[PDB]
Design a protein around this nucleic acid. Structure first.
Lengths: 229, 59, 171, 74, 102, 454
RNA sequence: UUGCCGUUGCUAUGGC
RNA sequence: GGCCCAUUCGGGUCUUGUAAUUGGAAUGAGUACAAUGUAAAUACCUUAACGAGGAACAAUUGGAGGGCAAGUCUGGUGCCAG
């Protein structure tokens, strides 16, 4: 009854935890019970993960948010107070949620793909992201599928990454879900299979969608740290 | 010993089945509680008495 | 298991008489069980012979079959050919059981003394006390069949008959 | 005052023939019909008992000079 | 004489706890004798005898070894907070009965 | 070609199993287990320690100060030593005596301190295998082992007992019998920096104990002849060798599992390998071990082989065929009984009955680059293992030890770059298990100490 | 420097 | 004296029998201390104490053949046949 992304062992139970509503969707997130209890194993059961949630160790996106099924989606920096645990969780190359450990100056921010820019009411420019941070007043040159950098103390955009040909992009969606390498090709079609294409070890080619891909930095310099093997 | 409860249960059922037809009803009553038997057991005992389908004798 | 084709011919009756008497068996079901699975084994090895050399099935399943037959211990280390699996037979299989092996190693005086030692738990291969007589010891567990350390024929405290006789003679 | 039942009403082994202690165990019966069989085998064949035990005392049972117990061909 | 072996000792700061697997060794004894095992565990680790706990005991065939799950706390009060109520009924001090109706 | 088809089909099989280096190469389960690895405790006992003391060619060899302190005990059998983090040593003999030495006076011969001699007084009054709880040895003490902390020495032999003596007084604190009739102990080894003893008993059994709790941990089974030698390091692994089954096993003792390593040298293929252009042959019995580090060990055989084995290869990595020579052939005045030298020479059959010396002692200094081999060739040999860990090589010899070497081990001194060691070797005129040894060529029952430097 | 015994050194060896 | 073959006469073979006495060992079903397990309890696992001579702590089912009475019945060319 589980998805593939959670890295959930089959010998666990019968009812799978539906995440509650929140920032991200159901299909692109993992809740805190499947995060803490059975992935990096700070708990043994739902009772004691509710106990540490009542103790309020979790500090995801700089706020506490004491809830069992809180849908932590892409790169919400899970922060735990004891042993200064800073966790940025991204996608691995085979579809799961690889939770990388980072440090404090990297967990002081996150980034987010812009979805739409609106002239909503009363002359106010407007920007949303995958956690829905409706932050005030970016520059006019925010296209769709660019990348804002959230402040995580206040909410303001601090840095901006422009989407164009020659940018380091992350793909979350479809049969390319979780690949990095961002350059063999660029092809913007007019309604589907439109993208920037991603290399491999032998620099192979790949096809995805615009909304299923979003930028993380430059060719060699992302200010996100990434795990390795 | 619920083990010996089950063992003597089966042995009484088989010895009763050699004296009555093979497939008569042996009923099991538990301990007496407040002067008389448990009313669940007496309820389905009366359920067994209520369907018995008597056959006519000769004398 | 399964019953044989003609189960009551006189050769079969004298066969089962010799087998049960020479190996201390209780009934026909021991012979019939071990012969049923031996029938499966060499009915498979017959097909492995009816296919040809350099067949993948023959190469891999043949050396797999003779190596796990050698490790059960019914086949010696040097005959690593597949026709010896056809030459294999039923008392080669029930010489490997623990009752036969306890008697042959000499912890018992007969196969019946071996059967009652095993069922009275004085015999342990390796770490665990084995207590059923038809156990099919392997070529590595062949040399650790010894008396259990929980038993008076090992080194343990003597049983109830010996200690009650000692107490009554102390009275 | 408890008129307990007894063994013949309890086990109900009504009117059986006299049976065998060796039949009460399936293993001991085949132990003792194999000992009987391999005592009969000494009658039909001549069984190799294990060779010369001590000093060769003699044939201990007789030598027949007329009997030849050998299989002639065709 | 019982014998004790801790293995795979990790620390849980979120639950203020230190947990491990417990190979308990009793040649020619019956089994683990869990209160005596909590005594032996509380003296091989530091004092906290009402904050050390074991729950998952499986003895292998033929006796001798048994694998259990050991978790030891500092601060007996937060051990009472974090442990479940049935294990507190089993070992420590808590006793609240359920209302018997229907 | 059938083996070629087997190799080819196995290669295709493994390729198909793979079917069912990029810039991003991170795996979620591996990094999660590495987070648990960062969370855990006890990076102390379980170091998979490699060879960190590379000093084989460094120290001197040829001018050791060799003192052969002869002692009056028939057939010394074992040697146990001790260093804290004054040093004591222990010897034991076939005359049922344990003897404590001080050894810390490094530039001179060791000093006797205390006897502890069992005898016929300690035979039990029962002949019953579980009331073997006497306080002394009545038969043939074979092995001593000092504690890594030094509270106790623990010894045992053919009287199927483990007597644990205190250090400061040589008194029997506790007796633990091995509870069966053939339970003679043959080798003892503490795991390093601990209180856990691994005894190897001739029931094809390995017993383990905690000495300061007077308890037995685990009995572990699985050799096929008598477990003639044992060896351990700081890890809870152990390495035993049974004699004639020609296999050496190593035991994950908590898991109670093992890795077996058989021998497998054949004079047919070996003489063909020489025939491509010679007195070397097959194997009798693997006899002695010492675990050099937590990935390699070395075995001493019965045909004079010394072999070097890894943790990742069944067959051995390196051999050294003749390690102490071949024995002097029996004389023509002691073979035949004819009159003429021609027939008494014909009764030698040429070279067919020359038998090699068998290595009866082997000691690898733990995690170091150098080990020491000993037999009754009169000369101990010192070998260093090459830094790529796929070979060893004879450095030098220590030729002041006339007799069988029933035990070798070393005693350390000096700091990280300047070091000096005294190699103790128990010397007898008779093998430590049975007699079997003729042509006692100037042997004496002593302690061969050598002081090696630099 | 030892179970005796010999050379001993004023310490090393060799016969049981 | 037992056993085996054979239509017959007979032949072949060999330590074989006996409600004969007797001896100390073994333990398992059962009875049961517990502890473990588990929300709790059952069960599995581990386990001290007792537990065999008709070891009566009393397994069956089916087959082949006799032999006996101051006995009974039938036939008929005594004493027989059935």
């Amino acid at each position: 009854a589980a998805p593939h992304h959670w890295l959930l062992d089959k010998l666990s139970g019968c009812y799978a935890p539906r995440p509650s509503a929140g920032p991200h969707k159901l299909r692109e997130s993992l809740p805190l019970i499947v995060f803490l209890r059975n992935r990096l194993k700070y708990a043994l059961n739902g009772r004691e993960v509710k106990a540490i949630l009542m103790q309020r160790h979790v500090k995801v996106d700089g706020k506490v948010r004491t809830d069992t099924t809180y849908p932590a989606g892409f790169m919400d920096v899970i922060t735990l107070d004891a042993t200064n645990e800073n966790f940025r969780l991204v996608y691995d190359v085979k579809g799961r949620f690889a939770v990388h450990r980072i440090t404090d100056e990297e967990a002081s921010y996150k980034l987010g793909k812009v979805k739409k820019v609106q002239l909503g009411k009363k002359g106010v420019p407007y920007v949303v992201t995958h956690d829905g941070r409706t932050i005030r007043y970016p520059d006019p040159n925010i296209k769709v599928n660019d990348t804002v950098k959230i402040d995580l103390a206040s909410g303001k955009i601090t840095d901006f990454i422009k989407f164009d040909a020659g940018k380091l992009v992350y793909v979350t969606g479809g049969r390319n879900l979780g690949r990095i390498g961002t350059i063999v090709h660029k092809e913007r079609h007019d309604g589907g299979f439109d993208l920037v294409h991603i290399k491999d070890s032998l620099d192979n080619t790949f096809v995805t969608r615009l909304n299923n891909v979003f930028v993380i930095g430059e060719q060699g310099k992302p200010y996100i740290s990434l795990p390795k093997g | 010993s619920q083990s010996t409860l089950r063992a003597s249960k089966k042995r009484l059922k088989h010895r009763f089945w050699t004296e009555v037809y093979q497939g008569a009803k042996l009923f099991y009553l538990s301990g007496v509680i407040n002067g008389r038997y448990p009313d669940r057991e007496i309820l389905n005992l009366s359920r067994f008495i209520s369907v018995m389908k008597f056959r006519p004798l000769k004398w | 298991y399964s019953t044989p084709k003609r189960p009551y011919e006189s050769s079969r009756l004298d066969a089962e008489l010799k087998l049960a008497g020479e190996f201390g068996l209780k009934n026909k079901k021991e012979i019939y069980r071990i012969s049923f699975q031996l029938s499966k084994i060499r009915r498979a090895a017959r097909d492995l012979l009816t296919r040809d050399e350099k067949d993948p099935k023959r190469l891999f399943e043949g050396n797999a079959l003779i190596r796990r037959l050698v490790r059960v211990g019914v086949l010696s280390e040097d005959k690593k050919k597949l026709d010896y699996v056809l030459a294999l037979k039923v008392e080669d299989f029930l010489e490997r059981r623990l009752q036969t092996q306890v008697y042959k190693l000499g912890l018992a005086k007969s196969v019946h003394h071996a059967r009652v030692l095993i069922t009275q738990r004085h015999i342990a291969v390796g770490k665990q006390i084995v207590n059923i007589p038809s156990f099919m010891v392997r070529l590595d567990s062949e040399k650790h069949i010894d008396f259990a350390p929980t038993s008076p024929f090992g080194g343990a405290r003597p049983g109830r008959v010996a200690r009650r006789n000692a107490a009554r003679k102390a009275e | 005052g408890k008129r307990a039942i007894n063994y013949q009403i309890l086990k109900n082994k009504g009117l059986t023939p006299k049976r065998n202690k060796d039949n009460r165990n399936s293993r001991v019966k085949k132990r003792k019909k194999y000992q009987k069989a391999q005592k009969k085998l000494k009658s039909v064949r001549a069984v190799y008992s294990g060779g010369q035990s001590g000093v060769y005392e003699g044939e201990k049972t007789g030598i027949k000079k007329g009997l030849t117990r050998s299989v002639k061909f065709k | 004489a019982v014998t004790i072996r801790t293995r795979k000792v990790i620390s849980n700061p979120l639950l203020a706890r230190k947990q491990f697997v417990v190979d308990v060794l009793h040649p020619n004894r019956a089994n683990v004798s869990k209160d005596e095992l909590r005594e032996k565990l509380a003296e091989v680790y530091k004092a906290e005898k009402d904050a050390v706990s074991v729950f998952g005991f499986r003895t292998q065939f033929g006796g001798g070894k048994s694998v259990g799950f050991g978790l030891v706390y500092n601060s007996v009060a937060e051990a009472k907070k974090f442990e479940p109520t049935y294990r507190l009924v089993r070992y420590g001090l808590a006793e609240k009965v359920e209302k018997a109706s229907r | 070609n059938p083996a070629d088809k087997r190799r080819r089909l196995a290669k295709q099989y493994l390729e198909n199993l793979k079917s069912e280096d990029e810039y991003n190469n991170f795996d979620a389960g591996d990094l999660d287990k590495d987070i648990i690895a960062s969370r855990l405790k006890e990076d102390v006992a379980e170091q998979q320690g490699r060879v960190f003391r590379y000093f084989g060619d460094k120290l001197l060899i040829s001018e050791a100060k060799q003192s052969f302190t002869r002692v009056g005990e028939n057939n010394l059998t074992c040697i146990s030593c001790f260093q804290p983090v004054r040093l004591f040593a222990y010897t034991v003999s076939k005359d049922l005596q344990l003897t404590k030495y001080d050894i810390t006076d490094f530039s001179k011969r060791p000093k006797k301190l205390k006897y502890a001699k069992g005898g016929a007084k300690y035979i039990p009054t029962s002949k019953h295998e579980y009331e073997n709880t006497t306080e002394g040895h009545y038969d043939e003490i074979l092995t001593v082992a000092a504690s890594p902390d030094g509270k106790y020495v623990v010894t045992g032999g053919r009287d199927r007992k483990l007597i644990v003596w205190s250090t400061e007084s040589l008194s029997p604190v506790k007796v633990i019998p091995t509870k069966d009739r053939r339970g003679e102990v043959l080798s003892l080894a503490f795991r390093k920096n601990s209180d856990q003893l691994y005894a190897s008993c001739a029931d094809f059994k390995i017993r383990t104990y905690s000495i300061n709790q007077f308890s037995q941990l685990e009995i572990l089974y699985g050799h096929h002849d008598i477990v003639e030698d044992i060896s351990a390091l700081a890890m809870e692994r152990c390495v035993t060798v049974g004699a004639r089954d020609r296999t050496a096993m190593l035991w994950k003792i908590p898991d109670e599992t093992r890795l077996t390593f058989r021998g497998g040298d054949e004079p047919q293929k070996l003489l063909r390998r020489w025939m491509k252009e010679p007195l070397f042959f097959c194997e009798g019995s693997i006899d002695v071990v010492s675990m050099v580090d937590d990935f390699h060990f070395i075995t001493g055989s019965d045909n004079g082989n010394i072999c070097l084995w890894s943790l990742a290869k069944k067959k051995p990595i390196f051999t050294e065929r003749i390690a102490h020579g071949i024995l002097p052939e029996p004389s023509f005045n002691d073979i035949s009984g004819e009159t003429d030298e021609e027939l008494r020479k014909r009764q030698l059959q040429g070279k067919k009955l020359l038998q090699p010396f068998w290595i009866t002692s082997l000691y690898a200094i733990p995690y170091s680059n150098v080990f020491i081999s000993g037999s009754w060739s009169g000369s101990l040999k010192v070998w260093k293992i090459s830094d790529n860990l796929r070979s060893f090589e004879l450095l030098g010899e220590l030729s002041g030890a006339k007799g069988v070497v029933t035990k070798i081990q070393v005693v350390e001194s000096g700091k990280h770059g300047k070091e000096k060691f005294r190699i103790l070797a128990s010397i007898a005129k008779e093998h430590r298990l049975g007699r079997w040894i003729a042509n006692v060529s100037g042997a004496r029952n002593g302690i061969y100490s050598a002081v090696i430097d630099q």
